Amino acid sequence: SQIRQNYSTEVEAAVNRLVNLYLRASYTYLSLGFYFDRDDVALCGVAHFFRELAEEKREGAERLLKMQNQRGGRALFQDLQKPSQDEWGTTLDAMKAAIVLEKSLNQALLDLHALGSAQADPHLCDFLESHFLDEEVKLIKKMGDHLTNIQRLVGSQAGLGEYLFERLTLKH
Amino acid sequence: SQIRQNYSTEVEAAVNRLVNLYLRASYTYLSLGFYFDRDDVALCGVAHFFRELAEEKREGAERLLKMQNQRGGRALFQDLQKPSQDEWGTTLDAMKAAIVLEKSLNQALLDLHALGSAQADPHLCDFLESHFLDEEVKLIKKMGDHLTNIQRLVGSQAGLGEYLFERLTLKH
Amino acid sequence: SQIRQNYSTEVEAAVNRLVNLYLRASYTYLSLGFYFDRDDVALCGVAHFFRELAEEKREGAERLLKMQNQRGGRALFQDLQKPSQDEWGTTLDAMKAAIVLEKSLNQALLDLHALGSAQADPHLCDFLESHFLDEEVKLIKKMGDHLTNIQRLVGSQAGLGEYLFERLTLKH
Amino acid sequence: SQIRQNYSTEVEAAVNRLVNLYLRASYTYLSLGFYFDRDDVALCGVAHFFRELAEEKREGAERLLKMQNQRGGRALFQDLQKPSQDEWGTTLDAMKAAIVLEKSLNQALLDLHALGSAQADPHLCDFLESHFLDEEVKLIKKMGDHLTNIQRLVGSQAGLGEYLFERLTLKH
Amino acid sequence: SQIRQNYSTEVEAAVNRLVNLYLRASYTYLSLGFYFDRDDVALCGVAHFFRELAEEKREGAERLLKMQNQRGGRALFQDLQKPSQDEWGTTLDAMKAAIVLEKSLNQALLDLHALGSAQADPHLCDFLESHFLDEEVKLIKKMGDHLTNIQRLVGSQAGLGEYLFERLTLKH
Ligand SMILES: [Pd+2]
Ligand SMILES: [Pd+2]
Ligand SMILES: [Pd+2]
Ligand SMILES: [Pd+2]
Ligand SMILES: [Pd+2]
Ligand SMILES: [Pd+2]
Ligand SMILES: [Pd+2]
Numbered sequence: 001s002q003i004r005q006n007y008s009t010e011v012e013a014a015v016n017r018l019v020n021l022y023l024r025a026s027y028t029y030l031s032l033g034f035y036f037d038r039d040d041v042a043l044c045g046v047a048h049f050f051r052e053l054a055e056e057k058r059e060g061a062e063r064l065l066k067m068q069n070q071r072g073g074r075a076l077f078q079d080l081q082k083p084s085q086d087e088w089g090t091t092l093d094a095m096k097a098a099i100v101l102e103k104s105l106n107q108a109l110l111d112l113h114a115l116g117s118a119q120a121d122p123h124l125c126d127f128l129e130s131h132f133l134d135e136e137v138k139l140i141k142k143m144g145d146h147l148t149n150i151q152r153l154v155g156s157q158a159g160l161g162e163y164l165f166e167r168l169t170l171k172h
Numbered sequence: 173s174q175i176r177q178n179y180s181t182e183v184e185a186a187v188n189r190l191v192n193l194y195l196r197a198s199y200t201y202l203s204l205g206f207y208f209d210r211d212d213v214a215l216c217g218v219a220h221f222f223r224e225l226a227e228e229k230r231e232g233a234e235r236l237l238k239m240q241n242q243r244g245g246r247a248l249f250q251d252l253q254k255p256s257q258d259e260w261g262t263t264l265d266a267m268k269a270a271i272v273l274e275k276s277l278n279q280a281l282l283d284l285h286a287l288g289s290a291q292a293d294p295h296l297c298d299f300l301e302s303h304f305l306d307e308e309v310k311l312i313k314k315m316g317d318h319l320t321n322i323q324r325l326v327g328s329q330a331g332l333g334e335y336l337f338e339r340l341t342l343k344h
Numbered sequence: 345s346q347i348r349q350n351y352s353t354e355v356e357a358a359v360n361r362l363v364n365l366y367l368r369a370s371y372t373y374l375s376l377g378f379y380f381d382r383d384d385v386a387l388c389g390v391a392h393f394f395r396e397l398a399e400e401k402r403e404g405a406e407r408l409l410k411m412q413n414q415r416g417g418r419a420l421f422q423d424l425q426k427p428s429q430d431e432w433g434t435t436l437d438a439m440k441a442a443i444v445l446e447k448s449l450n451q452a453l454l455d456l457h458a459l460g461s462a463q464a465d466p467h468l469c470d471f472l473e474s475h476f477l478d479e480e481v482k483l484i485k486k487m488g489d490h491l492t493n494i495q496r497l498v499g500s501q502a503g504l505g506e507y508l509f510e511r512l513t514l515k516h
Numbered sequence: 517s518q519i520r521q522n523y524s525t526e527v528e529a530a531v532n533r534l535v536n537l538y539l540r541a542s543y544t545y546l547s548l549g550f551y552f553d554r555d556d557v558a559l560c561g562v563a564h565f566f567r568e569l570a571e572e573k574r575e576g577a578e579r580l581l582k583m584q585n586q587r588g589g590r591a592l593f594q595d596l597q598k599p600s601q602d603e604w605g606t607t608l609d610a611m612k613a614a615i616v617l618e619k620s621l622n623q624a625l626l627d628l629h630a631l632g633s634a635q636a637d638p639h640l641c642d643f644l645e646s647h648f649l650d651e652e653v654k655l656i657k658k659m660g661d662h663l664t665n666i667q668r669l670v671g672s673q674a675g676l677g678e679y680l681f682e683r684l685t686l687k688h
Numbered sequence: 689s690q691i692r693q694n695y696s697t698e699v700e701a702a703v704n705r706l707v708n709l710y711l712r713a714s715y716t717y718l719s720l721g722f723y724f725d726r727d728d729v730a731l732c733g734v735a736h737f738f739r740e741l742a743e744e745k746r747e748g749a750e751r752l753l754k755m756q757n758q759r760g761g762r763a764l765f766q767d768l769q770k771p772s773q774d775e776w777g778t779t780l781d782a783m784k785a786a787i788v789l790e791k792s793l794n795q796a797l798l799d800l801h802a803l804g805s806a807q808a809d810p811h812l813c814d815f816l817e818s819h820f821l822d823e824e825v826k827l828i829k830k831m832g833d834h835l836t837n838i839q840r841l842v843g844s845q846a847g848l849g850e851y852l853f854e855r856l857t858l859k860h
């Protein structure tokens with residue numbers, strides 16, 4: 001290094017883990033994105049929603065890696081586990097799986113902020129705030145909104161509701 | 173001629189047949205296009221979808237004919253059989269008939285490419301690639317997507333789903 | 345006069361009657377237009393569709409009156425009977441009543457053309473062609489298209505279909 | 517239907533026949549268009565002249581089909597016979613065959629107008645006037661002009677005249 | 689090298705030969721181009737037609753050489769034989785010699801594609817397709833068209849036809 005200052009080995013390690021988490025989340029969204037582009041699923045707006053998220057999670061991993069280098073920490077990459085599912089069911093199933101995924105990332109961010117606080121590392125605490133914490137809260141709110149609307153559309157005709165939600169809410 | 177080189181009589185004949193196939197497909201789509209413009213059918217977006225395809229298949233026949241002349245082959249036209257139906261039923265029925273039609277054209281293209289390969293005619297093989305093969309794959313994918321969405325909309329209220337699909341997917 | 349030439353008293357009288365018919369049709373559409381603007385009916389697109397027709401039928405009467413003066417005939421106005429209904433029921437009911445109304449105007453136009461032919465009055469025959477006959481055919485076709493779509497939307501949930509048709513077909 | 521008014525079964529049938537005629541004429545011009553693009557014929561302006569006509573005749577069939585639906589008639593398609601020739605000889609031969617073809621279409625239009633008159637169908641009579649009758653007269657006049665100029669160029673050197681006509685009159 | 693992969697010595701050698709062929713063809717067209725600029729020949733459009741081809745064949749050799757380096761093959765240049773003639777006779781003679789030349793290049797391209805296929809070298813097969821095969825087919829078609837028109841103009845007055853072709857087809 002030569003630059004490292006007030007940056008604990010504990011935070012460095014947690015940041016590398018959080019990179020793996022974000023990359024895993026990107027991979028999961030990549031899978032979701034292609035599943036909804038299958039000719040037997042064919043929900044364009046849902047596919048684009050998840051493809052967009054795959055890109056956001058990748059960008060989050062890259063921002064963490066840049067920060068790791070800015071602090072004099074060292075990136076360490078691990079094997080990326082495949083997503084939990086090969087097929088993702090309905091839009092409802094997928095949005096449920098998405099909120100749980102996001103909740104898990106948010107909790108990892110909270111655990112890291114807690115560690116930053118315990119380690120008296122305010123640069124970390126700020127970094128997470130501006131790039132990650134508020135973004136997660138806004139995203140989880142949106143998914144909750146979507147889940148509520150998906151659920152109101154289930155009714156007795158599930159196909160009709162799945163079509164209308166994709167057409168009228170997720171418009172490409 | 174004076175220009176013909178490496179262009180077998182077998183390929184020349186197959187190209188003339190494929191022209192007839194494409195023209196037949198154009199005629200079929202012309203019929204479909206007008207059927208959905210009937211006052212007792214009246215699905216504007218479906219009519220435009222098939223009218224657009226009638227034009228594409230005609231253009232495909234014309235490109236084959238131009239290629240036939242470029243190679244020194246001779247166009248031979250045959251009687252064009254009328255479409256298989258006078259009335260085409262629902263949007264679902266029509267999209268089903270469309271995919272089968274496209275599959276039959278795609279298989280004719282594949283048979284011709286195979287013949288090109290057996291005849292060692294790379295100009296042919298390339299021509300088909302760029303103008304026909306990838307276009308068919310994209311088109312069949314789209315029709316599969318449409319079929320999936322049509323089918324999800326059938327539910328218990330078929331009229332409602334047929335209206336919504338035309339309004340929200342085929343928007344003119 | 346001083347200008348009247350080849351213009352029979354029979355045609356002059358029929359033209360005055362046709363003016364009354366067109367004005368009556370305008371009045372009927374005026375009533376329809378306001379009925380769909382009632383707070384307990386409230387179908388904006390349907391209201392605008394009929395208001396637009398009230399204006400078209402008025403313009404048709406004015407064109408006939410201008411022609412009457414161009415030929416040296418004399419406008420004679422009669423009492424305008426009120427519309428056949430005070431309340432018009434559903435969009436379906438109204439579109440049914442509209443097509444019958446239009447059919448009755450079209451038949452009056454046909455009867456007048458027949459009279460023009462019997463009276464050897466080609467200026468009349470042409471006038472009706474360009475301003476009235478083709479317009480009626482296009483309009484009746486459109487109403488037939490609408491009726492078909494309204495009817496497909498009735499299903500088991502009439503309110504839903506009436507709302508969707510107004511929102512998605514009659515968009516203001 | 518629900519819209520059909522003053523539209524006889526005789527006219528409906530004649531319109532379907534006239535569609536077949538126009539489509540046949542389009543096919544004939546398509547054949548002519550490609551024949552003049554053969555490397556051993558190679559008269560660019562003549563090819564474009566006939567290709568342009570193939571498109572015009574197709575558009576004429578489509579306008580008739582649209583009108584058939586506007587009146588509440590039902591399109592019925594028949595097998596399209598191949599053109600009368602596989603090879604078309606000289607520009608002269610082709611222009612001679614073109615005028616006869618056009619004369620045959622014009623006579624079909626005249627027969628249909630006569631039927632419209634006998635059936636007291638002024639909408640038909642007008643439709644044919646504006647879209648077909650005057651167009652045929654202008655086109656036949658042009659072909660007559662071309663035939664006269666082709667014939668003056670035959671002389672003792674037929675190749676020279678055929679080249680000059682294509683270069684100087686049919687300029688692409 | 690360090691980059692060479694799936695690139696046989698047989699293909700490398702054939703590519704070097706094809707470079708020599710293309711350069712020879714450029715030289716031949718250079719000779720043709722200047723012959724038609726002689727004060728006692730003086731056919732401007734014919735000169736420009738061949739000068740343009742000299743440049744195209746040179747560009748083809750350069751594209752092959754670039755590809756040879758892209759694959760890790762090594763350019764080897766050989767003595768360039770002078771053209772088969774010092775004087776080229778009529779436009780007809782020259783266009784005849786041009787088509788034979790082009791046919792010989794096309795056959796070399798076909799032989800190389802065949803070799804690519806036997807050597808399982810798809811990058812080669814594609815390269816030839818896009819840059820060479822379709823270009824040759826279009827060019828040979830054009831020369832066939834020209835030959836047909838030249839021949840129709842010979843008549844009984846060869847000078848007149850040679851002048852008219854240069855003026856009216858090869859316009860600079
Ligand atoms: Pd999409
Ligand atoms: Pd999309
Ligand atoms: Pd439409
Ligand atoms: Pd439309
Ligand atoms: Pd309104
Ligand atoms: Pd409104
Ligand atoms: Pd051309």
Ligand SMILES: [Pd+2]
Binds near residue numbers: 560
């Ligand atoms: Pd041209």
Ligand SMILES: [Pd+2]
Binds near residue numbers: 736
């Ligand atoms: Pd020059």
Ligand SMILES: [Pd+2]
Binds near residue numbers: 732733
């Ligand atoms: Pd010059």
